[PDB]
């Protein structure tokens, strides 16, 4: 591996994407991690770990889903804005742009949800609450099974120890998937993804000397992410059961 015009153009793409990521996403992984380790005086979250702490702290399913889906709108707008900054993206057929985001945003939401999770739980009410994993898991079926696979994904994903620089290229790779159903012009999307993949591979070698197969492990995680999105459809069937209104409100902030 050599330092040359190719590599410099790839480091320039990585920087361009990092900058547009920072403009596009107010809640970064660095900020999330800071909250979870108790640095941010500003945000010291109340921990909800059981029914009693739930009270102090202040189809049911379909209603939750209607809720979170509408609350995703801000994230969807941020990712859409982020996509406009990927070189070539706005030159693609408009329908493909829309198809790429329609499928991609769910994967990106779960990717950025991992930033808000550790093994103990997940940040809620934008940094102000912390819902424990085992409390969520304790709830009655089917609700108890909702978040547990995302924690499983998040623990394995967070163990890769990606930073925001890494994540900005990863997210771009996800957006530019040539296999999404109904794409019209697969080739120009693959052309962009090829370039982003090169940038990601360089980024990971420079930023992660500890793990020389991180590139592959991180691509495999796209498979995991695809599975979690797909599992939501199968959970609609399992569902076809009362739940405390405060837990309903909390679930509407997850995904």
């Amino acid at each position: 591996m050599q330092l040359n015009p190719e590599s410099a153009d790839l480091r320039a793409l990585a920087k361009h994407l990092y900058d547009s990521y920072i403009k596009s996403f107010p809640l970064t992984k660095a900020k999330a991690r800071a909250i979870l380790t108790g640095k941010t005086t500003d945000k010291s979250p109340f921990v909800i770990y059981d029914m009693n702490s739930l009270m102090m702290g202040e189809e049911v399913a379909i209603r939750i889903f209607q809720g979170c889906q509408f609350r995703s709108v801000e994230a969807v707008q941020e990712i859409t804005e982020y996509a406009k900054s990927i070189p070539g993206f706005v030159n693609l057929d408009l329908n493909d742009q829309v198809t790429l985001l329609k499928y991609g945003v769910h994967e990106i939401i779960y990717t950025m949800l991992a930033s808000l999770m550790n093994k103990d739980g997940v940040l809620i009410s934008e940094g102000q609450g912390f819902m424990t994993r085992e409390f969520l898991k304790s709830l009655r079926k089917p609700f108890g099974d909702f978040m547990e696979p995302k924690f499983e994904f998040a623990v394995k994903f967070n163990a890769l120890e990606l930073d925001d620089s890494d994540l900005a290229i990863f997210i771009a790779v996800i957006i530019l998937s040539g296999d999404r159903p109904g794409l019209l012009n697969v080739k120009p999307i693959e052309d962009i993804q090829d370039n982003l993949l090169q940038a990601l591979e360089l980024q990971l070698k420079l930023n992660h000397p500890e793990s020389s197969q991180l590139f592959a492990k991180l691509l495999q995680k796209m498979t995991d992410l695809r599975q979690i999105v797909t599992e939501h459809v199968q959970l609609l069937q399992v569902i076809k059961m009362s739940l405390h209104p405060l837990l309903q409100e909390i679930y509407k902030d997850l995904y």
């Binding site: 969807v76 804005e81 408009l94 829309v98 329609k102 945003v105």
Partner: peptide, 13 residues
């Protein structure tokens, strides 16, 4: 479906 599509088209313009 068309909700998400619409929000994305709005966002893209």
């Amino acid at each position: 479906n068309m909700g998400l599509e619409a929000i994305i088209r709005k966002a893209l313009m």
